[model samples]
Target: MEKVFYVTTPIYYVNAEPHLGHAYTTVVADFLARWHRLDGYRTFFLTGTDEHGETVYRAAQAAGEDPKAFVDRVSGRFKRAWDLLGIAYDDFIRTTEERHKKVVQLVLKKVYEAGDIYYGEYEGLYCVSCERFYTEKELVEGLCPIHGRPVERRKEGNYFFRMEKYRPWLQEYIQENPDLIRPEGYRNEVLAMLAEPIGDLSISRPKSRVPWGIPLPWDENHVTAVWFDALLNYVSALDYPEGEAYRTFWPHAWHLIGKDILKPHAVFWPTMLKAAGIPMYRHLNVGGFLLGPDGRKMSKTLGNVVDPFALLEKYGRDALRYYLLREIPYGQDTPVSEEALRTRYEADLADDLGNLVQRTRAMLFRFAEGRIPEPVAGEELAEGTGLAGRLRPLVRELKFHVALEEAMAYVKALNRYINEKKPWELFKKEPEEARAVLYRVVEGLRIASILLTPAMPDKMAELRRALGLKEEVRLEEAERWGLAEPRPIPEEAPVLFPKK
Candidate 1:
């Protein structure tokens, strides 16, 4: 098979603006797409808003805007937010788009004809915020568990998908395929849910009740449920069954989602694909929730929330990107605060990386007259090298924080080497030795920048320019030592991460 990469973020529910948690998963998807592209893999990334269902419709009513106007603005905000965050998504597939609506209807019609979908009248506890139904045992204090709020008791004739029909086979498939769901814990959770037969999933709502969705192709009065409609965006964006992206990338599909929506992606999505006769996605990478400094979820009432816009303004783009991936380990909930972000930004981005680049730039001009020095005969330049070897697997497994740590280890050691070598001191007595030391330092910085580029694209670009290296970065460069070529260092170095 040819090397290809397809990664996706859960298209955010657009009831509100983008939050810290939204930024988390989207950034991870962007990093994966960016990294895979750098390694010469054909990659396609998708992200956008889930712009249908009662949730969004009610939210529109509250905002005093018509549903179309409301979704347009909110979905636009997500696009702008991802733009500001530097998310390199190849396609932004809004659920309201005609192409997506067509796919949703096609899939629904297929499942209906396959006898996997049926019309049923049922009563269930429904959470508007989550747009999901919860069983009595899943509720907390007579409320929807995830929303921690009241759920309405509703009895309506609805279209249902035969989720139970696939349980036995789905259970065995998940049991046999350990990698289908990530983090092991989630896979086990799915297994537990499957211990008893799962219920048929409510797949559609009557359009008279909720008119803000794609109408079912088999029936005119009902629209597909938001979960079913939203999950198909992954394939729809690929122009499923017709586009080249589907041909090359569908088998390699990798979904990055937060744990809050695990059941939908894990059970519902896979079964939906099965019902539709589509191959299962290759990997499901789950991330944990983002919490406030006080160890609670971010709440407006608590006033402890970190506004992503303010955070972006307070720090910068790539710094925010760096902090999220650096602080949050894979599938582990962690506290996020401006105080912690500041500490990380200053220590890691500004002081450690900035100081190394600043010194390297100044000395490359002073000692070597802004030229790449000839190869040193000795090991001063090669000190604290070989991180690229350790970085490959970590990145492959999506251990982003540890990969950054490996790259940072090289940065810190090279900094230590600079302090010990004192290239400035050598400049006066041993010009050759001084040039060698500076050359090694510059080479090390270049290599580290290459390794860090996927996570910190903008800053790494500036660092590449300041170091007189090409703007285009390749992962292959990081795999070896002494590959940096002769180029003139810039007369001025940009403050990559300026002091806030």
Candidate 2:
């Protein structure tokens, strides 16, 4: 009977190892889910590996292993990487799993009974790498537009979905519900795509070509195409067709995907849901790819690919999370360079926020004997003092980017206040005002620490502990605004993020 929130990252394709883009998307999903959980939502965070595809079949066969065994092995790599990255997914689904197969078949049966699917002779150029079927109009010199590689022309008899039949209704539904595809740009892109006359969406591939996939429930001679199989993971994970999780969370489901797959997620998937009487998702948030250090797309051929784990090791996860979220707003591509990462590390992570917390805590411990001063007389102290109110606005907003910037602004303000009030030197002459300065810095840190949990939950935990918040600061209580009410700190002041 509790409120529920369901969110998913695009189930990863198991043909390749997880990359920075995968890590970035999953990390964002993790943080969002965690924040919602902290706010008391019964949060379901789903991430998984897409195990059945032509690319996976070929990669496994080329490696001299059976497709099923190959899928398990390669998918395990993704599973392990998510664990290593500290992704706290509630369910890690693989298309090869029994539950997934059952759910997919059941959903297919629902749509099949509704007369949305039919068998037809199909001829199209298919890209193994992208696992997509492209029309001649969408191709570049008969090559896949995404991979820029030649596609194999295949002719077969398979089941197809009448996607064109639902075009008008889909357009109207999307227009009526503006938030159906989020960040606005991708939503409009989907609207534009629906404006055109849609071609029949081929939903199956001959088992002879891609047998690694789930076989069509209605037709055993062919298998469900990779996109259809992969997309179903979203519904299947929710326990569709007779599960309580599906009933509670389906209406609130949000799919987070990359822009490259916007058509499949925003257009095809919704129409499929509408045709079958399944509920449409709340939103499909599209994200852009990261360009390499040289401003080109990150790829192995150019030797510009980013190793996300290596970066995580070099920079703390909190800093990496901050950089990815703050550097790029959702729905737009952003360039990432090593130099830019370093600059952000120095400016935002190290100097502005981290160091400010460290130095302030150290001084508080040294001067106030490791106990936080209560805010009994602080309102008068900040009334006319322009320098003391920087972090005040941040604590009131509860926003990641705004709070981070405000924390640094408070740091700059205190640095100026130290120069003007001469707090360190004042301890010798007027210890009372010096105590007031110390109280101001401690209050700023408490506000910053609570605000930081949304951006960097792990580090924020450490920050809260150092500030003696464990006695009362539950994770649930940490997310609420203006809860930083100044109090005495404990004796133990640990270093939060030591240089990695």
Candidate 3:
């Protein structure tokens, strides 16, 4: 199964430091990339900075720093945050990169030649933070709905991509391919926007307004719009058009984004692809926002933003990562509360999985001298467990929470097995049989921990270490009930997840 699998998170805008929402997207992308890679896909994972934008340009201006220096520093902040979070990315591209600038120009030239781009006069209420013109109706109470800020009413002439030209075709394409924009609701949302007049997308900005951006190839005075430049990074990061990576992974391209930018990725991107004679990406997976207690997007703007670093600092990386995905279902909004996170860390991780390992290690070490006893010859744990098989489709369908739910179920059940079996009591009367029970329970946990590897890679690996099995189990082999041979486990119990 050497198929290709490509995944990307939005090139996070560089105006601000990374936050909880940003981390959530990257974690999901990392989880998908790791799982697909393990399943034998030629996987490409891309994430980086959207360096050119009015917002970033203004941020640089406010910082009294040169735009180039500003973007570099801010971009490094994103990279550093991802590194701190243990993100495993294959390529991180900046829109300011020459390779990416070249691709942006190539596609711009192609679309312009095809007559999808033309100079146009524009007048609208624009949100500088979002860098997009919003209709008055789109503005809430005469303010920018997204940022809850004032808008600038301005008029200018710029090149516009004839996005409206492809509205009919896009409508049909999405109607035909229902899975193109996921969560089903977002697909309907994009379709609803198309139901109205999907107007042309402005693709240029005069250099006088924002000088820090890729210059439109044919126009010396205008820079490519930020979204235009930013979106192309998805392709340019792959070294598109000629790179074998493009040829292999383009068709399998799966983009994960927050719902805030839904229109651009769901609508603008596909039309641009059509105009350039390029194929649209396979899937656009949208994640809902992680709000704070105030029910606002956890952000610096709101002052309600939870410091993810603080969470990571206290909970540790894997606990925070697991809580984000497991507690917040994909494509659903959930309020972020330290209390909830603290409880999850204490209950699901420490009370459930941690206790399972502690109990398993305690029983096995005492009964079998901390060595895995020989499982009764040909004695497997259950019916055709089929855990890998069951979890595979859940992940494939992006039912990540459900898969985690299933894994937690197994953990809880194994803990119950220990309580019910009373293996210590049996060890006194029938020591051989007791060790067999311990061996079977330990094997069951090995498989369960592997099922959780995509979410908690390091924790599960250490879980194996505590169980005296340090090697990785192939995804295909992990489900097969009894492959673990006798190995010497530690005499001392390690706390896999300590309570807060």
Quote the RMSD, in angstroms, for model 2: 4.4
lDDT of 1 by residue, 242-286 (tens): 888788889999999999999899888989999999999999998
lDDT for each residue of candidate 3 in 1-500, tens digit (9 for 90 to 100): 35788999999888767888899999999999888777667889999988987778778889999988989888988899989888889999888889998899999999988988899899989887776688989999989888999999778889998898999999999999988998988998998998988887788978877688898989979988888899999899878989888888888999999999999998889988999999999999999989897887666677887888999999999998888878888999888877788898898998888888888887877899879988653243463267778888899788898988987887777777777778898988998988878877888778787778878888989898888874586676665666777988876756999766
What value of lDDT does candidate 1 attain over all alpha carbons?
A: 0.85
Q: Any runs in candidate 3 off by more than 4 Å, and if so which?
A: 124-154, 294-304, 377-380, 491-493
Q: Model 2 off-target regions past 4 Å?
A: 1-3, 124-154, 377-422, 429-433, 471-495
* Candidate 1 Cα misplacement greater than 4 A, ranges: 61-64, 124-154, 377-385
Instruction: Answer with 2 or 3, whichever has the higher TM-score.
Output: 3
Ranking by TM-score: 1, 3, 2
Query: How would you encode candidate 2's per-residue C-alpha lDDT over 352-425 as one tens digit per residue?
Result: 66676677677676666666655534452342233214433332222334545654565566556655765577
Please provide TM-scores, in order, for all candidate models, with all chains considered together. 0.93, 0.86, 0.92
- Model 3, residue 189: what's the lDDT? 92
Report clashes for each candidate as comma-separated counts. 0, 1, 0
